[PDB]
Structure 1
Amino acid sequence: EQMRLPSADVYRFAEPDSEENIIFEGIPIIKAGTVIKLIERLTYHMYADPNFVRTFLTTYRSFCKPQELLSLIIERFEIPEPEPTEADRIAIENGDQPLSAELKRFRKEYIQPVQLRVLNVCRHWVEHHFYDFERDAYLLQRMEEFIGTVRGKAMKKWVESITKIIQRKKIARDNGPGHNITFQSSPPTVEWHISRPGHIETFDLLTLHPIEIARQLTLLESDLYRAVQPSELVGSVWTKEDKEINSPNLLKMIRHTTNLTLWFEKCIVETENLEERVAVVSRIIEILQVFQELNNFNGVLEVVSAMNSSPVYRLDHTFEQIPSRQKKILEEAHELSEDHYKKYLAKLRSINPPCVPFFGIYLTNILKTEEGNPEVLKRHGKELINFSKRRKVAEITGEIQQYQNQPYCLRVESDIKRFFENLNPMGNSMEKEFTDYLFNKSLEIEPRNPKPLPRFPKKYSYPLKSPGVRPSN
């Protein structure tokens, strides 16, 4: 009795499971499938599958376009009803209403179930991935068209649910971001050093207070971390040609990291006087120290990256003068990264909020997953989409997400914020050219051992003494 399901002449989502169309790894977990089998199982009539819905909608762009998805789920929804029996045909021939017994049960046990799973996909799509519709107005047109042409008593509650979500997201992106954290305790006083409040023209590494540099960079990096959406990381989309559209928050995070790291390097090697340069390196290790007190691991490893860089790491005469206890701070920070990040991961998972995780490790691990797993599995001459590959990426993005909920009890200083948002150490140079300049500047200020060490004039007119990293109170 196969003929209860609709035929392949009329419906593409009812062909049998085979080893040529679906591989699996309780609700079953799919390893690989054709897109039709993935859509079918996304909307399967016998059970709901919230883990697969979530993971599919996070990752589908690596195997299917949004417009193709919408077409496929609409096609999924439009199930053909079976032909009436000879007796039902006789009934309507006689002028009567037919009994319709199988038609009624097929509606109950197939059509309605599938259709409510399609509307659930729509709801999850608009609720958690509204960006696809912000990025494509015609996709939003199609969605609203499809949703307003869904008729029926059982469907209309969903149509409401979806329409109301679509209203909220349109209203929210019209309004923009707002202030949505009341401080749950009193934040500490903003710290100031040489630069006076408002006097932004004097803002620099040594002239702002090291505590406040570290706090304001932590607030900034916290917001950047929190703004990354999972799909920005799937498929390596931030390395592809449409990176600026598909990965905006991700690329903001990456470019911030690049600009802060290179700015630290620039501050160091452009201070040619040894003693001033020691005070600069020492101030950066103080900022590191405050990053670690805040559990901004992102900022700790940006300082580490700068201290391990080509231009900076070779500056033996500078590091000789750094106090032993600041050397120990810097050594411990480096040891976070050793052995595949062992101590980092242990500390991450044991602290209480708030923190900023190191973002670079997630990129590294996602790239390894992307490069170490095939896009397709071949079975019997057919290519199936490797869905396990996407699930493994989605699980890494879910680790990201678990820490995106950790606001700091720190007050924003708008001008210091803007100073760090507007860091541009490279200028109009390309990265490679800029880092070649940095390395050449390093060789100038501390030549390779056979050549002697010149002295260089001082460049800072204010005192080099730090105020330290203990706050007021």
Structure 2
Amino acid sequence: QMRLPSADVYRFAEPDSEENIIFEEGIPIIKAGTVIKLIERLTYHMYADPNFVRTFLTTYRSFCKPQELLSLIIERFEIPEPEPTEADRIAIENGDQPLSAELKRFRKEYIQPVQLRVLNVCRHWVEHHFYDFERDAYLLQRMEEFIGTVRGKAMKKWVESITKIIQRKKIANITFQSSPPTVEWHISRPGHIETFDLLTLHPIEIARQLTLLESDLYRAVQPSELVGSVWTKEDKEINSPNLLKMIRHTTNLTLWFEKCIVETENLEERVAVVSRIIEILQVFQELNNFNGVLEVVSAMNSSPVYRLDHTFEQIPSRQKKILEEAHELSEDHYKKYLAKLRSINPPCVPFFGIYLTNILKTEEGNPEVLKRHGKELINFSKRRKVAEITGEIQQYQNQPYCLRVESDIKRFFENLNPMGNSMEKEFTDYLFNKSLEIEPRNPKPLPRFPKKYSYPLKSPGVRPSNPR
């Protein structure tokens, strides 16, 4: 076994004890520890665990400041070499070259692995958590200085590499093999953005373009917008702008569906509108856009729309089935949604709401520290639980959709603003009054209303076409 430097010159050589580290009941899993012990294990000489690095770098700011983290890993990097053993001493006193067997084993099995892994923490830190440096230019200078003064031929390839990566990052493309399907058009023809609307665009192309849009919004959310539950606090617009942008799109699209429905007062036309939205839902399912699916389900279950019994009576049974099965995904705390998400072949667009609730509750129902023997240990298993969630989010963010963007249709949906200049409550009340108007409460009889659409209402359907 290797002898370690003295704990008096090198703090990371303290023996493991229940006072500084606790393991969970082929690598160990850490339940809690001091910062020193967490950083030793983050850069352990005995095994590889890159997932520990992602976990740590995602969550460390709740127990350690960035400046302090850098100090600690620089200190971990600076390992004292042992003095010559007795056999070496005797060779040197006879004018011979010592074998230096212990020094060489220590360099090869302790110093080089620990220093490489310190460098790997720096690399991951800069590549995937660069916002620490964007928000603190002095932290970046210390990093650049540290990396740029590492000497020794052993570390050289990675030192040069990390220097280039830092530079690239400071001044901050898809292969498919098969082609995207052809863009589908209906009543609105290419270029005629003025005529674009729920019934005039092709429902296949509506679902596709909304899926591209919602996928891009999903893929833009960073872990920094989630950890510490910052999307719920006062500065959420500062700290979680991508998340909120994503949520607001979902909300706007749901309100647009509701608005399209209750503002169609003629019963026959409203049936065509509801039926077109259920067809869009069906393409959402085909594309694994679960965010899209729940936009539709949320709209059908809203107060203005849910109560329209006369409208739903006229919907084809096959479409009632499609809608009801989509709604069942959300029942029992999303039981069937979760099972379906974990069984499909990506790309997909998850529903983000479940993640937010799990992160918030994990952070709220677990203590920051555990107290053992008078010592305060960082509760690391709480951090690992949060990073399991952000990790799953990132996993579904990797796979891109093989679909062609249509710039005008994308623009039309980006600028959708169903509420206009109205406040939420006022607009919400308006929708419900519209609902009461077009289908009054029992026992008041059902009125008739004039048609408003001058083009045909027949759907082109949701099966794609393919010319040569």
Shift of 1:466: 2.3
C-alpha spacing 1:376/1:457, structure 2 compared with 1 (3 Å): farther
Shift of 1:445: 3.3
SS in 2 for 1:377: strand
Partners of 1:61 and 1:275 in 2: CA distance: 58
SS in 2 for 1:3: coil
Shift of 1:72: 2.5
C-alpha spacing 1:93/1:19, structure 2 compared with 1 (3 Å): same
Partners of 2:199 and 2:298 in 1: CA distance: 20
C-alpha spacing 1:417/1:385, structure 2 compared with 1 (3 Å): same
Q: Is the CA contact 2:285–2:293 (under 8 Å) kept in the aligned structure 1?
A: yes
Shift of 1:265: 1.8
C-alpha spacing 1:183/1:15, structure 2 compared with 1 (3 Å): closer
C-alpha spacing 1:472/1:105, structure 2 compared with 1 (3 Å): closer
Cα deviation, 1:327-347, whole Å, max 9, x if unaligned, reads 111011112223343433343
Shift of 1:97: 13
Shift of 1:382: 3.4
TM-score (structure 1 length as normaliser): 0.84
C-alpha spacing 1:324/1:17, structure 2 compared with 1 (3 Å): same
Partners of 2:255 and 2:124 in 1: CA distance: 41
Cα deviation, 1:45-67, whole Å, max 9, x if unaligned, reads 44443231122122223433333
Cα deviation, 1:98-154, whole Å, max 9, x if unaligned, reads 999998887666555433321121012123333433444333222112211222232
SS in 2 for 1:79: coil
Partners of 2:186 and 2:29 in 1: CA distance: 58
Q: Is the CA contact 1:315–1:446 (under 8 Å) kept in the aligned structure 2?
A: yes
Shift of 1:351: 3.4
Partners of 2:59 and 2:22 in 1: CA distance: 18
Is 1:187 the counterpart of 2:186? The answer is no
C-alpha spacing 1:219/1:101, structure 2 compared with 1 (3 Å): closer
Cα deviation, 1:449-473, whole Å, max 9, x if unaligned, reads 2444444444433333322223334
Shift of 1:314: 1.6
Q: Is the CA contact 2:2–2:106 (under 8 Å) kept in the aligned structure 1?
A: no
Cα deviation, 1:366-387, whole Å, max 9, x if unaligned, reads 3343333333223234332221
Shift of 1:95: 16
Structure 1 gaps of 5+ residues are: 173-179
Partners of 2:235 and 2:13 in 1: CA distance: 35
SS in 2 for 1:355: coil
TM-score (structure 2 length as normaliser): 0.85
CA RMSD of aligned residues (A): 3.7
Identity of aligned residues (%): 100
C-alpha spacing 1:145/1:298, structure 2 compared with 1 (3 Å): same
Partners of 1:244 and 1:382 in 2: CA distance: 38
C-alpha spacing 1:102/1:332, structure 2 compared with 1 (3 Å): closer
C-alpha spacing 1:328/1:49, structure 2 compared with 1 (3 Å): closer
Shift of 1:30: 0.6
Q: Name the stretch that deviates more: 87-96 or 154-163.
A: 87-96
Q: Is the CA contact 1:234–1:390 (under 8 Å) kept in the aligned structure 2?
A: no
C-alpha spacing 1:444/1:212, structure 2 compared with 1 (3 Å): same
Q: Name the stretch that deviates more: 87-96 or 54-63.
A: 87-96
C-alpha spacing 1:440/1:390, structure 2 compared with 1 (3 Å): farther
C-alpha spacing 1:342/1:99, structure 2 compared with 1 (3 Å): closer
Shift of 1:448: 2.6
Shift of 1:185: 2.6
Cα deviation, 1:248-269, whole Å, max 9, x if unaligned, reads 4333322222221222122222
Cα deviation, 1:10-45, whole Å, max 9, x if unaligned, reads 554444433333211432211112222212221234
Partners of 2:176 and 2:46 in 1: CA distance: 47
C-alpha spacing 1:445/1:136, structure 2 compared with 1 (3 Å): farther
C-alpha spacing 1:74/1:379, structure 2 compared with 1 (3 Å): same
Q: Name the stretch that deviates more: 25-34 or 239-248.
A: 239-248
Partners of 1:230 and 1:26 in 2: CA distance: 28
Give the number of aligned pairs: 465
Shift of 1:160: 1.1
Partners of 1:393 and 1:150 in 2: CA distance: 34
Q: Is the CA contact 1:184–1:409 (under 8 Å) kept in the aligned structure 2?
A: no
Shift of 1:237: 2.9
Q: Name the stretch that deviates more: 409-418 or 147-156.
A: 147-156
